Scaffold this active site. Structure first.
Site, PDB file in Angstrom:
ATOM      1  N   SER A 187     -55.437 -20.878  -7.372  1.00  0.00           N
ATOM      2  CA  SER A 187     -55.064 -19.984  -6.285  1.00  0.00           C
ATOM      3  C   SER A 187     -55.060 -18.561  -6.843  1.00  0.00           C
ATOM      4  CB  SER A 187     -53.675 -20.372  -5.748  1.00  0.00           C
ATOM      5  OG  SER A 187     -53.349 -19.654  -4.564  1.00  0.00           O
ATOM      6  N   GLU A 192     -58.187 -23.135   1.835  1.00  0.00           N
ATOM      7  CA  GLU A 192     -59.229 -23.729   1.004  1.00  0.00           C
ATOM      8  C   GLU A 192     -60.596 -23.526   1.649  1.00  0.00           C
ATOM      9  OE1 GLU A 192     -58.290 -24.453  -1.753  1.00  0.00           O
ATOM     10  OE2 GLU A 192     -59.567 -25.894  -2.800  1.00  0.00           O
ATOM     11  N   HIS A 211     -55.691 -26.438  -0.293  1.00  0.00           N
ATOM     12  CA  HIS A 211     -55.055 -25.509  -1.219  1.00  0.00           C
ATOM     13  C   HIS A 211     -53.690 -26.046  -1.639  1.00  0.00           C
ATOM     14  CE1 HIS A 211     -55.854 -21.565  -2.897  1.00  0.00           C
ATOM     15  NE2 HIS A 211     -54.583 -21.235  -2.750  1.00  0.00           N
TER      16      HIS A 211
HETATM   17  C1  LIG Z   1     -55.744 -14.074  -0.092  1.00  0.00           C
HETATM   18  C2  LIG Z   1     -55.048 -15.138  -0.950  1.00  0.00           C
HETATM   19  C3  LIG Z   1     -53.781 -15.615  -0.226  1.00  0.00           C
HETATM   20  C4  LIG Z   1     -53.102 -16.707  -1.067  1.00  0.00           C
HETATM   21  C5  LIG Z   1     -51.851 -17.219  -0.342  1.00  0.00           C
HETATM   22  C6  LIG Z   1     -51.482 -18.581  -0.947  1.00  0.00           C
HETATM   23  C7  LIG Z   1     -50.169 -19.103  -0.339  1.00  0.00           C
HETATM   24  C8  LIG Z   1     -49.622 -20.201  -1.267  1.00  0.00           C
HETATM   25  S1  LIG Z   1     -50.700 -20.788  -1.984  1.00  0.00           S
HETATM   26  C9  LIG Z   1     -50.161 -21.638  -2.949  1.00  0.00           C
HETATM   27  O1  LIG Z   1     -49.126 -22.493  -2.323  1.00  0.00           O
HETATM   28  C10 LIG Z   1     -48.411 -23.419  -3.218  1.00  0.00           C
HETATM   29  C11 LIG Z   1     -47.431 -24.263  -2.341  1.00  0.00           C
HETATM   30  O2  LIG Z   1     -48.112 -24.980  -1.325  1.00  0.00           O
HETATM   31  C12 LIG Z   1     -47.710 -22.587  -4.363  1.00  0.00           C
HETATM   32  O3  LIG Z   1     -47.062 -23.424  -5.291  1.00  0.00           O
HETATM   33  C13 LIG Z   1     -48.765 -21.701  -5.097  1.00  0.00           C
HETATM   34  O4  LIG Z   1     -48.135 -20.896  -6.059  1.00  0.00           O
HETATM   35  C14 LIG Z   1     -49.539 -20.794  -4.111  1.00  0.00           C
HETATM   36  O5  LIG Z   1     -50.547 -20.075  -4.810  1.00  0.00           O
END
Ligand SMILES: CCCCCCCCS[C@@H]1O[C@H](CO)[C@@H](O)[C@H](O)[C@H]1O
Ligand SMILES: CCCCCCCCS[C@@H]1O[C@H](CO)[C@@H](O)[C@H](O)[C@H]1O
Length: 283
Positions: A125, A229, A261
């Site tokens: 991510s 995703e 994601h």
């Molecule tokens: C433009 C990019 C926007 C990205 C936004 C991502 C939101 C959460 S994502 C992802 O969710 C998980 C829990 O589901 C967490 O543990 C992670 O740390 C996190 O990275």
């Protein structure tokens, strides 16, 4: 995914002269070379997301590789910020690139014998792009980099805006304090897509993964996870195309017809890349 322990996992306090504070680091020894496991956007101050959501330590135990899990840095993108976040009262400036490439490796080398060179940066991510950027500018330290569901073209189109919104939602951080306005050169400097030529020149071994938004029995079946995703997959496909077009020839691109994601899939990839890292870092 499953806890883990019984294993030799330590909790360290590594001073950061650049940030004026101590950075907590979770560590599991096992070899001179290590896998740097970077956290996601919502990185917490108690445990790194990999330990919280996956059997990462257990999975790399006795792999011949040490495992480094820095803790903290919510919405930091593991980069060196221009200034303190003007929004949530941060009383110091994030200097995570300096910490990861100078302060932390020096500490681990002096006290534990972990080599400052020949390691792997693994991010997901938020940190997916960070791992590739670290490999792009610090090839000696990171001849290997993996990006799991990363946002590989942060300076293009609406990404700067979306990243800003996400950062605000995650701890109220301000993207402007980090890399300035989208027009600031910092956005392109830290854009994996833009830095592909560097990855080619370095002959960096890259592992790039991204699901398509369709969950499997592994879970992560929720709208946000599915949409994110699907959206970033487009950037990953373009990264792959550009990498090849630019002469790239040392990458693994995993774009299966599934995955959201979420942590279950990132853990599956962490396991899948183990043998690849072992062979590349330990010959
Ligand atoms: C433009 C990019 C926007 C990205 C936004 C991502 C939101 C959460 S994502 C992802 O969710 C998980 C829990 O589901 C967490 O543990 C992670 O740390 C996190 O990275
Ligand atoms: C319902 C319609 C949703 C459209 C979503 C578009 C999101 C744009 S991402 C963007 O897509 C390009 C496609 O060519 C890639 O080249 C870039 O690298 C990548 O960052």
């Amino acid at each position: 995914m499953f806890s883990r322990p019984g294993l030799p996992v330590e909790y360290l306090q590594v001073p950061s002269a650049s940030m004026g504070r101590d950075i907590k680091v979770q560590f599991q020894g096992g070899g001179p070379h290590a896998v740097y496991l970077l956290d996601g956007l919502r990185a917490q101050d108690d445990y790194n997301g990999w330990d919280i959501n996956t059997p990462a330590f257990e999975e790399y135990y006795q792999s011949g590789l040490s495992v480094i899990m820095p803790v903290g840095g919510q919405s930091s993108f593991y980069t060196d910020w221009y200034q303190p976040s003007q929004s949530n009262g941060q009383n110091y400036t994030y200097k995570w690139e300096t910490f990861l490439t100078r302060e932390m490796p020096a500490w681990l080398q002096a006290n534990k014998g972990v080599s400052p060179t020949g390691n792997a940066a693994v991010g997901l991510s938020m940190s997916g792009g960070s791992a590739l950027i670290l490999a792009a500018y610090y090839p000696q330290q990171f001849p290997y980099a993996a990006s799991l569901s990363g946002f590989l073209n942060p300076s293009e189109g609406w990404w700067p805006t979306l990243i800003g919104l996400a950062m605000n939602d995650s701890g109220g951080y301000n993207a402007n304090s980090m890399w300035g306005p989208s027009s600031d050169p910092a956005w392109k400097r830290n854009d994996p897509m833009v830095q592909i030529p560097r990855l080619v020149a370095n002959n960096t071994r890259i592992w790039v993964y991204c699901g398509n938004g369709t969950p499997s029995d592994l879970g992560g079946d929720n709208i946000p996870a599915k949409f994110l995703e699907g959206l970033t997959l487009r950037t990953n496909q373009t990264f792959r195309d550009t990498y090849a077009a630019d002469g790239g020839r040392n990458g693994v691109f995993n774009f299966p017809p599934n995955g959201t994601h979420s942590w279950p899939y990132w853990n599956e990839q962490l396991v899948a890349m183990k043998a690849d890292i072992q062979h590349v870092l330990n010959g």
